[PDB]
């Protein structure tokens, strides 16, 4: 047959369509699912392995940088609340929802994972019954319904399509008796990412916690405390509940304790450093490593002022150690193959490059034509105050600025280059040389905005950057500030 179009790259999974409600004849026909070899969890790692032919030189700051990587001193009350709710709901065989919200990097996922680890340790001591832990991250899903595919695959071991998985989970949570079940603890991380238009997924996940036979713990980690009030309906907000756990950004003393806990064994300690290569061994010269308490304190105070984000504090300390290690390796010439201190200067330089703006020094290093464009644009904003200027007006005002300051030395040397490219055989041009080039360059830089128009004269252009930093970059130039 002759097709009207073709779909030649269809990749379909081997997922069955029949839900769990048709797996046995009756409710009484359902066996004990705990004594089943595929329920409740009853190969790629070696492809990224090779043989090492050299000996990596780990310098003395490499252990500091390794210990400062992201891979519970400040979360006691949050840990205790989450653990007590989960322990009470597991040991009494009930279903509940715990809500956790906070800004990035305040220890939400780490605290919930530690709670789950301690509950698994308590279930290994036969103090609470066994449970299955499932982690669903909404930003790791391709489609939002794939969470239905994930959770059911973690429960039964089957692979169904998402609608059949949703019916299977509904039948499982509602109809299967508690004597044939295991408790499930589900972490719904990045809860805002699973919010869709119809909000059926959110309703189903929080409504399964209201069923009497469910034995389901849903720990929902969010980014805002008012997500059910802003984005969800009244039905899902009623099911989530009034009790919500806020993870506040860290104060500077807790960030100080976090950084000291990552460096408890390294700070104020001695290393055997081999001066031939640079390789350092933690307990040939005996060198003491030190990072200043003033440096850690000022980085922690800065980070707690900004966000209270532990990732940022660890990254600022790691960047300071990297800067100091770069200077040390440069001054000794070591390569990769008596007191070494990472100081408050390195911490301030790590804190400054994140706060430095390149926009002004980008604009001060442009050519004369791009600066002339920006200067004429600012002149037109001063003349009429419209904040959007047509490109033809910019052309006319560039021409005006050339013919008005014609007695200037630099302008009377630049005019032949601008309008004829220094050639007698080239006619006088309506645009300057490199007009399109500097227009497109300022558009790709994000300095400029241009409307989608086909007439080149009446097309409007807007500053995307702030006006005063453009004026500062214009007054930096010698020629433009004199005319």
């Amino acid at each position: 047959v002759i097709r009207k179009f073709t779909k030649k790259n269809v990749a379909r999974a081997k997922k069955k369509y029949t839900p769990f409600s048709k797996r046995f004849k009756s409710i009484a026909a359902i066996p004990d699912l705990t004594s089943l070899p595929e329920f409740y969890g009853n190969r790629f790692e070696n492809k990224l392995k090779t043989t090492q032919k050299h000996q990596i030189v780990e310098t003395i700051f490499s252990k500091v940088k390794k210990q400062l990587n992201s891979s519970l001193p400040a979360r006691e009350n949050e840990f205790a609340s989450i653990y007590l709710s989960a322990y009470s709901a597991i040991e009494s065989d009930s279903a509940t929802t715990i809500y956790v919200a906070g800004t990035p990097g305040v220890g939400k996922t780490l605290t919930v994972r530690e709670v789950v680890k301690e509950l698994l340790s308590s279930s290994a001591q036969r103090e609470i019954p066994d449970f299955l832990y499932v982690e669903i991250n909404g930003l790791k899903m391709v489609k939002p319904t794939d969470c239905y595919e994930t959770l059911w695959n973690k429960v039964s071991g089957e692979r169904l399509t998402w609608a059949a998985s949703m019916e299977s989970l509904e039948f499982y949570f509602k109809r299967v008796p508690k004597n044939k079940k295991k408790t499930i603890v589900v972490l719904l991380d990045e809860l805002d990412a699973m919010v869709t238009k119809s909000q059926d997924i959110m309703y189903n996940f929080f409504n399964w916690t209201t069923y009497e036979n469910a034995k389901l713990i849903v720990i929902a980690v969010a980014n805002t405390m008012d997500l059910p009030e802003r984005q969800l309906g009244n039905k899902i907000t009623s099911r989530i509940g009034f009790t919500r756990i806020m993870f506040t950004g860290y104060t500077h003393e807790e960030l100080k304790n976090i950084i000291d806990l990552r460096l408890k064994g390294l700070n104020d300690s001695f290393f055997y450093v081999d001066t031939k290569t640079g390789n350092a061994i933690l307990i040939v010269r005996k060198v003491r490593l030190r990072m200043s308490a003033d440096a850690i304190e000022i980085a922690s105070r800065k980070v707690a002022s900004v966000s209270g984000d532990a990732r940022r504090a660890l990254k600022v300390c790691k960047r300071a150690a990297e800067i100091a290690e770069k200077h040390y390796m440069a001054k000794h010439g070591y390569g990769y193959d008596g007191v070494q201190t990472v100081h408050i200067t390195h911490v301030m330089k790590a804190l400054n490059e994140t706060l430095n703006s390149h926009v002004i020094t980008f604009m001060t290093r442009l050519s004369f034509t791009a600066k002339l464009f920006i200067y004429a644009l600012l002149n037109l904003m001063k003349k009429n105050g419209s904040q959007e200027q047509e490109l033809g007006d910019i052309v006319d005002e560039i021409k005006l600025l050339i013919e008005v300051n014609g007695s200037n030395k630099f302008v009377m040397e630049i005019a032949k280059t601008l309008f004829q490219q220094g050639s007698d055989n080239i006619s006088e041009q309506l645009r300057i040389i490199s007009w399109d080039f500097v227009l497109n360059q300022l558009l790709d830089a994000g300095i400029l905005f241009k409307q989608t128009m086909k007439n080149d004269r009446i097309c409007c252009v807007k500053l995307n950057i702030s006006v005063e930093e453009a004026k500062r970059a214009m007054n930096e130039d010698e020629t433009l500030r004199n005319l």
Partner: protein, 434 residues
């Protein structure tokens, strides 16, 4: 002469940058940047540290050049330590980036010694399984990374920066963008997982940086030809004289374009069209081919297109321009322009030009529209993306359903510009005034 052929071929190889890796030319103003990049690669491929960094610089500012040079340097000595995944934001979408990563992972892993099989859900699950005696470093080069830092949802950036942060597989991610404020594009969690390592690519700051870059581009440092020493002497005599034609063209590029690829695109046919060594030395002393090149690059603009017009075309364009200048919104049609045209022909003939009929001026009008002298009024033109273009292709615009003599147009060149570039000896010059 085979010696001049070898010298010419080597000069073209140096201009296109296709030298072997140990002979590769790094400009001095690019050095401290590239050593910085040389640190990060060497901390990832060799010392197995995880890094995330965005290169920020304009187009043709040597981001891909320096990254490719670093990968070529590491491939010569450490070729079993790392694999390379290349993504481009124009070519890969949010769906096809996953298939691109998985396909590149399998063709790189079989090159060192399936992941991409199945539906996109299974492919992404297998990528997260693989990525979330030593380890092989995965090096991501993500060109046009601003396109994946969209306002909607930055899923791939989230997962990739989580691979940098929490995974035990050593991952190096290099993003490239022209956006100066790339950090404001990132979502809060994506920015929290990003290291805020942003390397701003260096700019040319003064003239001797460009002269030194030209000297590095054109000096031949190997004994490939009998002509090498004489060519080096000629080139150094040209670049050391501040009044030479080469320094004048380099200065003009510095004040207009400030771009070494722009200069290279002109220098390449200067070398290639030379037939012997004496012609090449004469061409580099005079640089007259650079003037011919500059004239050709401006030949199809508004100024050059005007000089190709016939007298009737120029008359219709002048009449349309003065009608548009008299209009409040700059709009005009075929009828008003024809009325102005016949008023000028009888005003000229009263003081003998054939007065062309309205049925013959239609061809002139269509030629003027096709040559981008008039644009349809309030026309958007070329759309930014394929979705808006597809939306526009299913709608019938009101300009295309009315007769052609009532369509509203606007000028691409105004009457003042027409007075500026039409010669005084032209007999329609007096009507460019009002």
């Amino acid at each position: 002469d085979p010696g001049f052929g070898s010298l010419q071929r080597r000069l073209l190889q140096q201009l296109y940058g296709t030298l072997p890796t140990d002979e590769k030319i790094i400009f001095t103003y690019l050095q401290d940047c590239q050593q910085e990049i040389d640190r990060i690669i060497k901390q990832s491929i060799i010392q197995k540290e995880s890094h995330s960094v965005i290169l920020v610089g304009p187009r043709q500012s040597y981001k891909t050049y320096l990254l490719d040079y670093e990968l070529s340097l590491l491939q010569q000595s450490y070729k079993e330590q790392f694999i390379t995944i290349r993504l481009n934001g124009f070519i890969h979408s949010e769906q096809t980036a996953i298939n691109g990563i998985a396909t590149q992972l399998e063709q790189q892993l079989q090159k060192i010694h399936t992941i991409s099989s199945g539906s996109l859900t299974e492919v992404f699950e297998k990528i997260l399984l693989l990525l979330d005696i030593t380890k092989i470093t995965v090096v991501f080069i993500f060109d046009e990374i601003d396109t994946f830092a969209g306002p909607v949802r930055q899923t791939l950036l989230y997962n990739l920066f989580d691979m940098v942060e929490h995974s035990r597989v050593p991952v190096c991610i290099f993003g490239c963008t022209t956006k100066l404020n790339i950090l404001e594009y990132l979502e809060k969690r994506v920015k929290s997982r990003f290291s805020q390592r942003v390397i701003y690519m260096p700019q040319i700051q003064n003239l001797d940086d460009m002269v030194d870059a030209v000297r590095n581009l054109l000096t031949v440092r190997s004994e490939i030809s009998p002509w090498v020493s004489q060519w080096n002497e000629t080139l150094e005599k040209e670049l050391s004289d501040p009044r030479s034609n080469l320094n004048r063209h380099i200065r003009m590029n510095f004040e207009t374009f400030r771009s070494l690829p722009t200069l290279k695109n002109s220098i390449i046919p200067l070398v290639a069209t030379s037939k012997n060594f004496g012609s090449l030395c004469t061409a580099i002393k005079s640089c007259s081919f650079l003037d011919i090149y500059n004239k050709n690059q401006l030949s199809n603009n508004l100024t050059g297109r005007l000089q190709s017009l016939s007298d009737l075309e120029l008359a219709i364009l002048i009449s349309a321009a003065r009608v548009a200048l008299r209009a409040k919104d700059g709009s005009f049609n075929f009828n008003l322009a024809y009325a102005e045209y016949e008023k000028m022909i009888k005003a000229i003939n009263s003081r003998t030009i054939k007065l062309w009929l309205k049925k013959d001026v239609k061809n002139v009008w269509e030629n003027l529209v096709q040559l981008d002298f008039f644009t349809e009024k309030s026309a958007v033109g070329l759309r930014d993306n394929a979705t808006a273009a597809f939306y526009a292709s299913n709608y019938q615009f009101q300009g295309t359903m009315i007769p052609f003599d009532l369509r509203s147009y606007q000028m691409q060149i105004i009457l003042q510009e027409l007075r500026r570039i039409i010669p005084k000896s032209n007999m329609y010059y007096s009507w460019t005034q009002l």
